[PDB]
Ligand binder design. Structure first.
Ligand SMILES: COCCOCCOCCOc1ccc(C(C)(C)CC(C)(C)C)cc1
Ligand SMILES: COCCOCCOCCOc1ccc(C(C)(C)CC(C)(C)C)cc1
Ligand SMILES: COCCOCCOCCOc1ccc(C(C)(C)CC(C)(C)C)cc1
Ligand SMILES: COCCOCCOCCOc1ccc(C(C)(C)CC(C)(C)C)cc1
Ligand SMILES: COCCOCCOCCOc1ccc(C(C)(C)CC(C)(C)C)cc1
Ligand SMILES: COCCOCCOCCOc1ccc(C(C)(C)CC(C)(C)C)cc1
Ligand SMILES: [Ca+2]
Ligand SMILES: [Ca+2]
Ligand SMILES: [Ca+2]
Ligand SMILES: [Ca+2]
Ligand SMILES: [Ca+2]
Ligand SMILES: [Ca+2]
Lengths: 122, 122, 122, 122, 122, 122
């Protein structure tokens, strides 16, 4: 569930951190095209693709099981797609945290003209 | 008027049904690209194209005349574009109802990466 | 800042005028592709590109200095990107006003199928 | 829950009818004081009272079982609070339908100055 | 209607000014009780009273005729309720302009605890 | 400001916790009258009172300095009103944490009929 994904992100970077990834670069947020603008943006490209490969369930609506163990995300008893979905978010959340140090505020709500490049394939 | 279109859909499938078609597949909702994912999604592709061919009026803002006769949509006294607009929505609404049995919840809020295919032309 | 841009537009065309440019043609609003549908729409294409060329700052979040002198927008003490950003909005706002006489309501919330053309380059 | 209440209303009066009751008279909607303006308003006063008597569950959030039978609302196999909640909703929706011909559009978004009278106890 | 009221305010005070009056003091905005905090607040109390006296039409929804003449608001050829509504709005907007220099930003989103005093009758 | 208040709450109780207090009991959220339903509600009554005593600044908008130290909230070097505001928020957030085990989900979106009792002075 997207709410859970936001939960992981905020649990990893702090309250409201999810908002730093709503419309960032060319792939973080609604839709996605062109080429990733940086590490953080690539995290979203990867996440988008991870979702694209899920079948049998809805990655943004399906509810899975997970938890935090000493500040680290932990996908619990999951089978099939649910397992895949949790894995998609867990990896994306850690990827944001891992690349926090290079987050470029100038990429927030990036201009449409800057993602006109060819859409890298999954 | 989009409110009227939502009226037809809800009148044909039930209260709030319109929300099942707000962001479904690759063409049901804001924007549209790639190739239709199913019958329901093709209904939206057709609807989008039907609008694209309307001239002289705004398909999403223009108000037309219509009504329900024994559970069936009926475009009334319409001339020119208004006639075309009502026809676009009427057909789309019946198309959703006609294909209700194959509606795939997994297509709601479909990942951007799954509509990367070539944009079928109208 | 986008709020400032809306300020210029409304200051030039009247209260709430900004809403006439939120989703107009193929480039006025969120995202932008295909070919401009008219003068007004080209104003937005130009504006989008003007933003795309800004570096070092966020064109939609950065706050610059400006004012109205006898009904005319005036970018004040600005240096670097801020200067560029204000210039982008000032030009766009005047461009809307300049082409008000050809504004086509039928272009508001234009169908996705009507911007399928090749995306003109900046 | 409130969504089910809305479906009851819409199922009895037509798509979007619930909106006719979001801010009507002195009681239809958030808060409520003063003299009811008509039968519809009286029923909103009662609906709130009915919710106020519920214990052990959240009337606006709890999900109960119900359905439509030949156009009439039927509360399903509910026990305890869920049964009371479904009833509150059923009675309120039937009342709106019952009094649809006296519904006065002039009471929509009523000024607070017309709801200052003393308030009756539930 | 309220949109026209907003244009009056913005036309007199500048773009987005209406927002300065959405939740100000004890009366500018939904509900209202207690002692007005200043002239601006007093005028909001009156505006609500003025709407409350209207009969035969919905003050917040009804559309009347008006225009600006040399910076001043002029209510057009309105009869019955529409004339009263336009007046309520005109007087309120002129009052906000009249008292713009005493407008106190500290009264924006005022705590409810400061609006408990007895309330004056319209 | 309110955003800082939300971060305090979320930092003490977890992501999105602030939402548990947007419309809870008779005082947690807009308006407030009647008898508090529990300790949490009592603290909301006080929080509003605390804001109501502030002068010279807008409690909901003013930005103060604060931080977290070993899980505890610390108000920074604030003078005048900013110090009082930070305190109002700190005390309220700590109270919600203190009483999280008595938090009753049945009081979320409480019916107005349960908040009619006389109201205590601040
Ligand atoms: C190409 O697109 C790929 C998506 O990019 C991945 C990055 O996503 C970060 C933002 O994701 C969310 C999370 C939650 C939400 C909702 C609306 C569910 C909740 C909210 C408003 C509390 C953040 C929306 C977007
Ligand atoms: C490529 O895009 C083609 C559009 O897809 C067609 C399917 O449309 C279904 C949803 O359409 C609506 C209908 C109404 C609305 C509004 C916002 C007017 C009303 C609302 C919120 C009550 C549903 C929005 C979208
Ligand atoms: C390709 O896209 C280019 C953008 O098109 C340029 C035209 O922009 C006109 C509309 O721009 C705005 C201005 C302000 C706003 C916000 C949300 C900041 C404020 C609001 C709601 C008050 C209008 C949104 C869009
Ligand atoms: C607080 O209510 C006091 C009593 O009034 C009873 C009349 O209620 C009218 C219907 O109320 C609502 C309000 C909101 C909604 C939500 C927000 C859940 C859904 C929506 C937007 C689809 C209408 C549903 C029903
Ligand atoms: C309920 O009012 C009590 C009396 O207060 C009078 C002061 O009113 C201030 C302006 O009020 C509004 C509120 C909302 C609006 C809407 C939502 C219609 C439009 C918007 C969002 C563009 C401001 C317009 C004017
Ligand atoms: C009016 O308050 C009366 C006293 O109640 C105190 C409890 O307050 C709970 C938290 O209140 C809010 C409300 C809104 C918000 C905003 C809208 C600023 C931010 C949001 C949406 C992220 C929660 C923050 C905190
Ligand atoms: Ca409906
Ligand atoms: Ca009754
Ligand atoms: Ca304006
Ligand atoms: Ca007065
Ligand atoms: Ca959070
Ligand atoms: Ca206390």
């Amino acid at each position: 569930n997207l709410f859970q994904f936001a939960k992981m992100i905020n649990g990893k970077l702090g309250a409201f951190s999810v908002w730093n990834y709503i419309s960032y670069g060319c792939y973080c947020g609604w839709g996605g095209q062109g080429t990733p603008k940086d590490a953080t943006d690539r995290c979203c490209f990867v996440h988008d693709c991870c979702y694209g490969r899920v079948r049998g369930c809805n990655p943004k609506l399906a509810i899975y099981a997970y938890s935090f163990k000493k500040g680290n995300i932990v996908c619990g008893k999951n089978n099939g797609c649910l397992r895949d979905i949790c894995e998609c978010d867990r990896v994306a959340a850690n990827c944001f945290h891992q690349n926090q140090n290079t987050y470029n505020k100038n990429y927030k709500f990036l201009s449409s003209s800057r993602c006109r490049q060819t859409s890298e394939q999954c």
